[PDB]
Each structure stands twice: as C-alpha cells, then as structure tokens.
Design a binder for this molecule. Sequence first.
Ligand SMILES: CO[C@]1(C(=O)N[C@@H](C)c2ccc(-n3cc(F)cn3)nc2)CC[C@H](c2nc(C)cc(Nc3cc(C)[nH]n3)n2)CC1
Ligand SMILES: CO[C@]1(C(=O)N[C@@H](C)c2ccc(-n3cc(F)cn3)nc2)CC[C@H](c2nc(C)cc(Nc3cc(C)[nH]n3)n2)CC1
Lengths: 285, 273
Amino acid sequence: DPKWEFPRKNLVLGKTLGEGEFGKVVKATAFHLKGRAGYTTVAVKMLKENASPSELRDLLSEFNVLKQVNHPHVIKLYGACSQDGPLLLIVEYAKYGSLRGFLRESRKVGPGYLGDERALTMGDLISFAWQISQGMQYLAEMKLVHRDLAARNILVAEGRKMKISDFGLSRDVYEEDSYVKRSQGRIPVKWMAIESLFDHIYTTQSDVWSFGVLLWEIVTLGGNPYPGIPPERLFNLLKTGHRMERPDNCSEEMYRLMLQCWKQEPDKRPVFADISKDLEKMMVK
Amino acid sequence: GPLSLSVDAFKPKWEFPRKNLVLGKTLGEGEFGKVVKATAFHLKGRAGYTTVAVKMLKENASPSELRDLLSEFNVLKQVNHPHVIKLYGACSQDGPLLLIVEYAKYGSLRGFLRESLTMGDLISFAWQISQGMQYLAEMKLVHRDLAARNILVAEGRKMKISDFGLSRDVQGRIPVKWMAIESLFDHIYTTQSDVWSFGVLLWEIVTLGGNPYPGIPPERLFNLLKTGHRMERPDNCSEEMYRLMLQCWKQEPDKRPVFADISKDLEKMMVKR
Ligand SMILES: CO[C@]1(C(=O)N[C@@H](C)c2ccc(-n3cc(F)cn3)nc2)CC[C@H](c2nc(C)cc(Nc3cc(C)[nH]n3)n2)CC1
Ligand SMILES: CO[C@]1(C(=O)N[C@@H](C)c2ccc(-n3cc(F)cn3)nc2)CC[C@H](c2nc(C)cc(Nc3cc(C)[nH]n3)n2)CC1
C-alpha cells in the first residue's frame, strides 16, 4: 500500500523497550515521516527469527486494523517497512510505557498515589478509565472486538494520555456482532468473560468484562487479578458466581460498575457509552 | 467447551500426592509457564527421593497454554521409549496443575551444543532422536514441533524428545523456519512433515546450535521454499549428511525418507568410522 509503506533507509532502530518469546517492541526514529521535516521518535513492533504463522498473521492483522481506526485514545499507525526485509510496524511513541508499568511505578515513585506527572489521585485513575472507555466506544462502533483489553496493553503517552494498543488479537464482528473460534484462544484466562472461556464467544460485551478487569487493575495500581488463584480454577470460580472482591482503594460506585461488567448474562452488562457516562458522573462528584 | 470438560475431567495411576513433591530452583521459563527442578518422595514405588522436572503454568496463562499442558499429559501416558521424555504423573488436587516428568541434567540440546564433541557424538544424537521418532510414528503420533530446543540431554548424553503440547495423533504456533512446505501452504501435519523438521534439527546439530536460514526473515521463507531454495551445506558437515538433510526437505512428502531410512542411514555412518 503506497499510503502506508515507509522507505526502510529512513527508519533507524534503537534499544529494545520490551520483548516476548516471538516478537518485540524497539524504540526507533523515522526521517521525513508523513510530512514532518527531520527525525521523529517512534516505536517499531516486529517479529523474532522464531516467529510462527499465527504471530505473523496477528502482526499483519494489527496493521490492517490500524489503517482503518483513528481515535485520540487508540495508538497511531505511521506506517510499515514490508518489502525487501522483515515486516516492521511503525507506531507512535508513548513515553511512559504500559499503564500497568506506569501504575506499578507510582507505588514506588514519588509523589505517588495520593487518594505533577508522577502524582496520582483517584480523579486521575477515573480519567484514565474514561479515556480507554471512549476508545472502546469508538472501536465497538467500528464493529471491532479487541479481545485482549488489559493494563499491559494500554500505553501511556505525553500528557498522561491513554492509548489502546496491542491489536493483534482483535477481530472484525460485522457478520453476527460476534467472533467465534473453534480452537482455544490466546487471551489470558483472568481477563476473559465467562462466555468466551466456556463457549468461545467474543463480543463487545466480553470486552466490557475485560474492561471491568482493567478497572480493578487501575484502582489497585496494576494489581494481578484473582491474586494467588491458578487460571484453571477460573472455570469453576466464575460458573458458581464468584467474582473478585472490592479492593481497598475503591468506592462502592466504582465496584458496582465492575460487578456490572462481570454479570454472567452479557445483555445485563453495560455498553461502553454507558460506562463513559458512569465515569463522567464519578468525575464530576 | 472442550477445555472446561478436560479441566473438570482432569480434576490414581498418575495422581502424585502434593505433600511428596518439593519444588526446587527454576530451570527456565517462558512468558506463560516454567520448568522447575524438584524432589519426589515415593515416586512410582521407588525408594527415597527421585529428582524430577515439574512443568507449571504462570498466572497469565491462556486457554491455549492450559490445553497444551493437558494435551501433553494425555500424550505422555500412552508412550514409553528410552528417547522420549518419561511422564511420572501430575498433581491435580492441591493448588495449581503440576506436570511431573523425567529430569535430564544438561537441559536443551540447542543449549548443550552452543556451550561446545566429535562428529561421532553428533551422529549418535541424531540417531537417538530418529529412533524415538520411529517409535512415535509407529504409535500414530505426529510431534509437530521437532527442534533442538524441544530435545533434552539426559545423563550419559541420552537424547530425550520433549515438548509434546502441540502433538496430534491419527491457527499454527510452530515456528516458520522448522515447518514443512505443505504445513506452511496447506496447514497439513503428518509424519513426513516431522521428517522435514528433523532435517532442520539435523542442520542444528552439525552447526552446534545454529539459527536456521540466518538473516532471512520468516515472512520471506514462504516464497524461497516454494521456488526451490534450501539451506546450503554448512561447515563441518559431510556430503553424506547434507544429502540426508536435502531429502528431508523434498517438496513432495512421499519423496522424503521415513524415520527407519533415516536411522538406517545414521547406523550406516557410525559403523563406517
Ligand atoms: C507492554 O509492552 C512492552 C512489552 O514488554 N511487550 C512484550 C510483552 C511484547 C510481546 C509481544 C511483542 N510482539 C511484537 C510483535 F511484532 C509480535 N509480538 N512485543 C512485545 C513493555 C513496554 C514497552 C514500552 N516502554 C516504554 C517506556 C515506552 C513504550 N512506548 C511505546 C510502545 C509502543 C508500541 N508505542 N510506544 N513502550 C513496549 C513493550
Ligand atoms: C527449553 O527448556 C527450558 C526453558 O527455558 N524453557 C522455556 C523457553 C519455557 C517455555 C514454556 C514453558 N511452559 C511450561 C508450562 F507448563 C507451560 N509453558 N516452560 C519453559 C531451558 C532448559 C531447562 C533445563 N535446564 C537444565 C539444566 C536441565 C533441564 N532438565 C529437564 C527439563 C525437563 C522438562 N526435564 N528435565 N532443563 C528447562 C526449561
């Protein structure tokens, strides 16, 4: 595609920001990038030499999705180097890294959580959730289930701006408002809705479940969900009716919103436009 | 679904009591799971403590990971061969799912070779793997993920085939650089695609844990293999051995050798030394 193909000579790759088993994200710089003069700091998502067909299909799918979606709280695609070399995916540089990493740092790093850029209040945590909810509102409007919504997969940009990232597992759902796969999914079990885990059904309403898990991560400052519980235990735990308890540092109003997101029946959960309104009513109060 | 049924089913011959397992140091770990050394008291009617390896999931494990671990348990109950990694059992009643397997002291074959052995030792390793694969092929088991990282090196340098989480009897998460051409283009996995992968494993042995297709990205390999290209003859490799690699990488699966032929070729190399 000529609108997205970037000259490889103009990209210069730097240090590794982080790494999986099959791929990595490196800090980079790009010369003469989409009208800009000079160099621009960017992130490059790419595969390792041990890459599977599924990892390659997912990186290709992330590229496809990112060409079609533009939102202030969705990570911005600049382009790709995809001829005479490996597939390099050029995306916006979010300076604070993951939301999980950012929030876990605020425990350790002063001024820290307080109930400018390192001082956090409950007001700021609600704001972060609201930004992500606004991005998911838009992504649900585009007929697009993210599936892997979690605090490790949100990035934190300049001005503490939330950027939904890691679109490799996201699927189109124009067909039937649902994505169903026969085989087992690669979403971590502790972020999955009950119908996704048991029945393999992924909708906007299972992204609402996952968002509920993200809310819990946000208020506990990057907590590990279902702490100490093996992931195989989630099948029986969720079926019988159990959900994560109210974390210390969380209002009744916020916990009701979490419990709403984790209703067994997906029609009884709130849509992303309602979630945005709840968080607005929390903010103003 | 399939996994909720398996998990529930999974929760006597293979149930090891948790109180007799003492987990030791971590041997290594991926994103979603780890392998730890342990001591097992009264393991399968054996006196005292037996050193074992324990595979457990990490707490961000997916359904895919959990299925693979249960699938490995399912496969390893049906197989017993000196060059396949032995299952002793599982802890399923007391906390997380622990899979208890044979302990091989030197780690992965890839890691063993990268530390480094004569050409006779290298040919002996390829033969052992080929023997275990001849056994697996006879048991109707396609391994799928044959590679030097998925072979373990036990005491006396005995090769153990391992990592049975992706094996199937009779989308894709096997790395592109080890997959057969019909696997790449048609998603077909047979004994003859294990042969292809063994050929890549054979290349890894003679290079002392080399990275296959070095400086070619996996995305470009599809069209290089389709057109006819293969890896050239590596250094410290005979004409006889390279010919055996090239035949494992024939496009048509019928033209590739079976594992009896491979073993027979390797038996004929060692007797001529
Ligand atoms: C959560 O993401 C990180 C990580 O460790 N990811 C692992 C788990 C990971 C797994 C698979 C693959 N794959 C990449 C592929 F192409 C395929 N898989 N890459 C990485 C940790 C945070 C890191 C980062 N740190 C800082 C300080 C800034 C920053 N800015 C960014 C990052 C981006 C994309 N834009 N701007 N990113 C990015 C990588
Ligand atoms: C290739 O295997 C190692 C590794 O780092 N693997 C990573 C990449 C990895 C990924 C996923 C999971 N998962 C485990 C799960 F349950 C799910 N995923 N575990 C580990 C490196 C070698 C290490 C080892 N070192 C030594 C010195 C000895 C040794 N002996 C053994 C090992 C066994 C099984 N029996 N005896 N093993 C075992 C782990």
